[PDB]
Design a binder for this molecule. Structure first.
Ligand SMILES: Nc1ncnc2c1ncn2[C@@H]1O[C@H](COP(=O)(O)OP(=O)(O)OP(=O)(O)O)[C@@H](O)[C@H]1O
Ligand SMILES: Nc1ncnc2c1ncn2[C@@H]1O[C@H](COP(=O)(O)OP(=O)(O)OP(=O)(O)O)[C@@H](O)[C@H]1O
Ligand SMILES: [Zn+2]
Lengths: 286, 278, 94, 219, 50, 74, 279
């Protein structure tokens, strides 16, 4: 079915520009619309969409309505201009999901066998690659609950297209690209420890909270399982590198050797040729 | 009577369907419609752009369905903003995006409907990322040849847009037409996330993910050694000697600075041992 | 249970815990290779059984406390020296 | 009932423009391929992500996109005239042996033509090769065509008929590749049989050197 | 080179063959696969080299 | 049972959309009938026939649409 | 910003591109290039590499609309059709003439030494010719000694009929025979075999035969290209024809083809030898 989704900045903006539409008139809830997907393969892609007036009451927390006269005839519009573009699901800006979201997908399953919902974010904050994606399946449960319909997270990734980077990538103009090979990889390293070890502390504090409160989630078992896959090397005191010690510097063996060999001859190219051309102009002029 | 140079405020949402709907018609030319509000004579804004059915038999003035707009405006009422129509646009991917013979026939028809009806063209081909490309024009009336034929006041917004002058046939259409200035009213809220969504997705996906060892340096040493002798024969070729050969010639680049950065790639990637671990 | 490694294991330790004779340690640890709990090949010169990967099972209250000891220890050690990478090398970047 | 709307949705697929065929030559790199359209221009273009490893090939006919000129899916070939050469039929067996003469000539192309298919092992074991060609002239009597014609479809339903009218073609005749095309589709039939009739026209002799029409005959 | 390429961008630029020269400054142009052309001035290099 | 006349109106209305596509059958194209299936790489099945053009160019288009493959040999 | 400008010029034109044929370098910053369609185009060269990969005659990629000069071939991707195919084996053993040693001594000096040898030539000063012309059939001869050389030595064999390069346009013709002879000087050792070029040797001025006369000037073009092999590296040109009466005098003239090898009429000698090989 649906494994991963591809969200373009163009269709994501179609949720963002509608945040100006109903944001000025208010009032409650969020921006919600129906998603037009482009499915060429198991990997899902999204090009365009259409935003529909939508509201969700608080009291009355289970009340939701799409406008389906907007959904029907406007489909024949986008279908007439683009035959490949069809509705794969819906979307909204979240930020989180209330329990009522179970009924939005099951209603529109007449349009698509499986409707994928995309939670987006109009204001970028944290922690990383934004928005979100969910898929609607039924896993029931191990405890014996009646059949449980819970949306499972779908990994979301941004993607590009021809001719769409004209105006999009133009307006920024302030970015330095990249530079690959010097700063590009090292800034990630400073962040790889930051973003790597912050979720380490956020989860290890919530995993300690388990014993305290919030149990379940037990989880189970996914938590410790892949944590023990992380445990191929801990790495703890001290590094257990006795076999990887001589191999540590042995990987730095040729990297330092070439860096010593290149800088020697690069100098011979830089130093000699500079002295030659310099004294040819300098002393022959005066 | 009084005519002042117009300034076009385009919304980042209206910029989407210009290139996107134009990409769907590639290679063939499409016909769209511009949506916006007329503030005054010297400024104009396009707040929305929508897609219109592409013509596989060629663009015509009847390609726009009036019941398509009448059903669209009604759907814009239940949508947040029901703004009145303004003008039209069309893609021209196959060439340098100039107004064709059909574009002038649909001018007097659209300029009768709406006052301005700015003619807007767009092309995918001229660039990819860092150029505005697109196009825009506005019909100056040929009946005005009896009157003064050189609008507009506040000139160089035209005059500067009259640069580069874009070859000949394009500005050959400057007879009976005059282009219009396109500036971006700030969407920067969306434009700030446009940079954040683009670069974060391009930074190692987590920034973590991405962060032929000696052999890649054995393949590099062929570029770091076997390339040296073909590079270091040139200073012996600079020795004539002396001097019958035409000079100067500079062979210093680009291999020297490439092997520099080649070590910059290999040194900081080897620092991943010291960086990631401890 | 242990942080290891301490990966390769001596046969006498298996002959202690599992209390199996030296001639039967082969069938023992190699059958686990087919079960899939450990892929580690066996070193038969010193007769020491080497381990690879691991099989996690369930969890205990002392396992979470044992986790925070040896898990966050990777977080506090790396980020401490990661600041050293940020400190000194921020001048050459700017 | 609803099958009509299905054909209406097929018209939406008819809105897609057709791509342009081309012949690949070789490859400079994985990102640069050299393709040549049937019209004769060559294009170094990029490729899209939906293709497979079978697209590369050693110069196999492919189709090029209408914009990026990238290869989508390769079509093997196309031939209009082939069907008119598919319909040739002759009887016998018996009707071939009923011609009354010459008696030994019926015993000739019987084992020469029809036999290789039913019993190829007889020739390869002894080591004798069957003849790769034959010539039947006349008319001291009749039977120049019929002798080879009846054994032509007696081998199998396989046959390919060639008329001398297709060789002359037109001014700057392109049938040079059609003689290759006609024989290409002759190999689509196995085992193949090739006819040539009335070669005294298209067999033009170079003894006395004439107009270049005699040269293109040799071509 | 970017600005100059825009001059050469549309059709590229061709190479002609002049069969005869005129004093009116119009020079006949001929491309090998195409037909003969002619154009008005067109004066760049000294005319004596043409 | 009367729904047959309801859909009969929309097929004639959409046949009028074919009329503007039927004016005019602008050019001659040599036909070659072909049947092939392409595994991907979900499954896409269909009949597609390689087409010619008398301009000496050759193109690739799905099987027509309108008149089916019943007529004729290429 | 200048390093960002380096990404600019490298961005242009990206894809797509079209092949074109370089003609000559007229001056700096620009050069003329013949299009694949045959129309010569005068294009500003790219500011990166103006010299080493230019070359007098080469196939250079051009942009679709702008036809911009960017990069040439390695060289080369070569061309269509194919080579080799003579390595299947067995054909004919050379031991038949092994008893003479008077015939092989002249053959041994005319085959393997002209293939690869260097210091022996400049010493004596004799410049070995590339010319091999085979006339005299019937009988067949010829291709027997062709695949027999394949037993002797191993080299790339270019096998094309004299009519193989005849096409509907006259712009592709000069490029094919150029791509055939430019791989001969590029790769060594190389042997090119064309069968019966006496066809295109027919001289007719008529416009409908203009392309037919265009391929005989192509024959005179590759004739101009065969002196580009002089000297000395590299090529081996073997020529075979059934009737040489239609050939031009300058084609058989020395300085290009200096050796005429006349295959003798079968007569009495080839009788008994040819009955033994079939039995
Ligand atoms: N022995 C025969 N038995 C039956 N019919 C025959 C016989 N010989 C000839 N025919 C008839 O004569 C017709 C022509 O036959 P065939 O091809 O042998 O002669 P042909 O080649 O046309 O004459 P020519 O050799 O002068 O060109 C056939 O249609 C066939 O029906
Ligand atoms: N021992 C032999 N002596 C003479 N000819 C032979 C011998 N063995 C094979 N051949 C013939 O040589 C032919 C191949 O020669 P090639 O391909 O050069 O054409 P060709 O004989 O030159 O054609 P043409 O005779 O019309 O010029 C084969 O058809 C084969 O029958
Ligand atoms: Zn138009």
């Amino acid at each position: 079915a649906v494994q991963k989704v591809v969200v373009h900045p163009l269709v994501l903006l179609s949720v963002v520009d509608h945040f100006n539409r109903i944001g000025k008139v208010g009032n409650q809830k969020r921006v919600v619309g129906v998603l037009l997907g482009s499915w060429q393969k198991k990997v899902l892609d999204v090009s365009n969409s259409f935003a529909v007036p939508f509201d969700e009451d608080d009291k009355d927390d289970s009340v939701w309505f799409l406008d389906h006269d907007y959904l029907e005839n406007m489909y024949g519009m986008f279908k007439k201009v683009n035959a490949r573009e069809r509705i794969v699901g819906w979307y909204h800006t979240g930020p989180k999901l209330h329990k009522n979201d179970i009924a939005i997908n099951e209603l529109m399953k007449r349009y698509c066998p499986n409707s994928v919902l995309v939670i987006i974010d109009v204001k970028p904050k944290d922690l990383g690659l934004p928005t979100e994606a969910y898929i609607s399946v039924e896993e029931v449960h191990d405890d014996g609950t009646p059949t449980s319909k819970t949306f499972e997270h779908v990994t979301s990734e941004i993607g590009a297209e021809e001719a769409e980077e004209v105006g999009v990538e133009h307006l920024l103009r302030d970015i330095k690209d990249t530079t690959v090979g010097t700063l590009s990889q090292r800034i990630t390293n400073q962040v790889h420890g930051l973003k790597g070890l912050n979720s380490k502390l956020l989860d290890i504090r919530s995993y300690l909270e388990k014993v305290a409160t919030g149990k379940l989630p037990i989880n189970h078992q996914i938590i410790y399982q892949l944590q023990d896959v992380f445990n191929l090397l801990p790495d703890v005191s001290l590094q257990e590198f006795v076999k990887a010690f001589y191999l540590k510097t042995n990987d730095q063996m040729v990297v330092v050797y070439l860096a010593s060999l290149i800088r020697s001859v690069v100098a011979l190219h830089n130093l000699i040729n500079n002295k030659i051309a310099n004294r040819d102009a300098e002393k022959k002029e005066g | 009577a009084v005519d002042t140079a117009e300034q076009v405020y385009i919304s980042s949402l209206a910029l989407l369907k210009m290139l996107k709907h134009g990409r769907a018609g590639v290679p063939m030319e499409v016909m769209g419609l511009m949506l916006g509000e007329f503030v005054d004579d010297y400024t104009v804004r396009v707040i929305d752009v929508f897609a219109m059915p592409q013509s596989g038999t060629g663009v015509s003035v009847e390609a726009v369905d009036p019941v398509f707009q009448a059903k669209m405006l009604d759907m814009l009422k239940q949508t947040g903003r029901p703004e009145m129509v303004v003008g039209w646009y069309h893609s021209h991917p196959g060439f340098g995006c100039w107004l064709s013979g059909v574009d002038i026939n649909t001018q007097q028809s659209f300029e009768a409907l709406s006052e301005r009806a700015v003619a807007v063209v767009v092309d995918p081909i001229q660039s990819v990322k860092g150029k505005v490309v697109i196009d825009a024009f506005r019909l100056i009336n040929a009946n005005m040849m009896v009157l003064g034929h050189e609008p507009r006041q506040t000139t160089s917004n035209l005059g500067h847009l009259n640069k580069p002058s874009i070859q000949a046939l394009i500005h050959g259409l400057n007879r009976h037409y005059y282009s219009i200035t396109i500036n971006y009213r700030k969407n920067e809220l969306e434009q700030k996330m446009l940079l954040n969504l683009h670069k974060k997705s391009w930074m190692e996906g987590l920034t973590l993910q991405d962060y032929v060892v000696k052999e890649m340096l054995e393949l590099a040493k062929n570029y770091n050694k076997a390339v040296e002798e073909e590079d270091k024969m040139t200073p012996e070729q600079l020795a004539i000697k002396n001097v019958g050969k035409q000079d100067p010639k500079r062979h210093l680049e680009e291999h020297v600075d490439v092997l520099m950065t080649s070590n910059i790639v290999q040194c900081l990637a080897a620092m991943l041992d010291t960086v990631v671990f401890k | 249970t242990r942080p290891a490694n301490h990966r390769q294991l001596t046969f006498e330790e298996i002959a202690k815990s599992a209390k199996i004779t030296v001639n039967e340690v082969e069938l023992l640890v190699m059958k686990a290779l087919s079960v899939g709990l450990v892929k580690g090949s066996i070193d038969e010169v010193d007769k020491r059984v080497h381990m690879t990967w691991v099989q996690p099972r369930v969890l205990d209250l002392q396992q979470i406390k044992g986790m925070k000891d040896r898990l966050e220890f990777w977080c506090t050690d790396v980020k401490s020296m990661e600041m050293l990478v940020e400190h000194q090398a921020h001048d050459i970047l700017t | 009932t609803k099958q009509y709307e299905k054909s209406e949705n097929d018209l939406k697929a008819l809105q897609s423009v057709g791509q342009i065929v081309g012949e690949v030559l070789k490859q400079l790199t994985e990102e640069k391929f050299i393709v040549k359209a049937t019209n004769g221009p060559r294009y170094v273009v990029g490729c899209r992500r939906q293709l497979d490893k079978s697209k590369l090939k050693p110069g196999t006919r492919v189709a090029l996109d209408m914009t990026t000129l990238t290869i989508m899916r390769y079509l093997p070939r196309e031939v209009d005239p082939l069907v008119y050469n598919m319909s040739h039929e002759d009887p016998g067996n018996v009707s071939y042996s009923e011609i009354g003469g010459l008696s030994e000539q019926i015993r000739e192309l019987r084992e020469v033509i029809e036999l290789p298919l039913t019993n190829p092992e007889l020739f390869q074991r002894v080591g004798i090769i069957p003849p790769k060609g034959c010539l039947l002239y006349g008319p001291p009597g009749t039977g120049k065509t019929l002798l080879a014609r009846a054994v032509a479809s007696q081998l199998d339903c396989n046959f390919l008929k060639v008329v001398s009218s297709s060789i002359v073609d037109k001014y700057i005749g392109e049938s040079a590749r059609l003689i290759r095309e006609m024989f290409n589709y002759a190999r689509d039939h196995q085992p193949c049989i090739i006819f040539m009739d009335e070669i005294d026209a298209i067999g033009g002799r170079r003894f006395s050197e004439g107009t270049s029409a005699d040269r293109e005959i040799q071509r | 080179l970017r600005e100059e390429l825009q001059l050469l961008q549309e059709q590229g630029s061709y190479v002609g063959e002049v069969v005869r020269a005129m004093d009116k400054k119009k020079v006949l142009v001929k491309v090998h696969p195409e037909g003969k052309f002619v154009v008005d001035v067109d004066k760049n290099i000294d005319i004596n080299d043409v | 049972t009367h729904e047959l006349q309801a859909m009969k109106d929309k097929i004639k209305e959409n046949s009028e959309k074919i009329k503007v596509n039927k004016t005019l059958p602008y050019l001659v194209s040599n036909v070659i009938e072909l049947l092939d299936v392409d595994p991907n790489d979900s499954q896409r099945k269909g009949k597609c026939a390689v087409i010619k053009t008398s301009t000496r160019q050759t193109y690739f288009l799905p099987v027509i649409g309108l008149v089916d493959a019943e007529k004729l040999k290429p | 910003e200048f390093l960002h400008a380096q990404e600019e010029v490298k961005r242009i034109q990206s894809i797509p591109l079209v092949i074109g044929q370089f003609l000559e370098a007229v001056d700096q910053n620009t050069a003329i290039v013949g299009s694949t369609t045959g129309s010569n185009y005068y294009v500003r060269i790219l500011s990166t590499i103006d010299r080493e990969l230019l070359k007098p005659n080469a196939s250079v990629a051009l942009h679709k609309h702008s036809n911009a000069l960017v990069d040439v071939l390695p060289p080369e991707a070569d061309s269509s059709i194919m080579m080799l195919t003579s390595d299947q084996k067995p054909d004919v053993m050379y031991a038949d003439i092994g008893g003479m040693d008077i015939q092989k001594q002249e053959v041994r000096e005319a085959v393997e030494l002209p293939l690869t040898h260097f210091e022996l030539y400049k010493q004596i000063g004799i410049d070995p010719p590339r010319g091999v012309l085979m006339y005299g059939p019937p009988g067949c001869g010829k291709t027997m000694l062709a695949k027999a050389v394949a037993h002797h030595t191993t080299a790339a064999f270019i096998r094309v009929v004299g009519s193989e390069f005849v096409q509907k346009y006259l712009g592709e013709g000069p490029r094919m025979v150029r791509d055939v002879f430019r791989l001969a000087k590029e790769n060594a050792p190389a042997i090119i075999f064309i069968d019966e070029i006496d066809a295109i040797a027919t001289k007719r001025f008529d416009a409908q035969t203009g392309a037919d006369r265009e391929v005989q000037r192509i024959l005179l073009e590759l004739l101009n290209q065969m002196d580009g092999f002089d000297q000395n590296v590299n090529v081996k040109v073997i020529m075979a024809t059934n009737r040489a009466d239609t050939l031009d005098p300058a084609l058989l003239r020395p300085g290009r083809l200096d050796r005429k090898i006349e295959f003798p009429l079968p007569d009495r000698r080839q009788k008994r030898l040819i009955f033994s090989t079939i039995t």
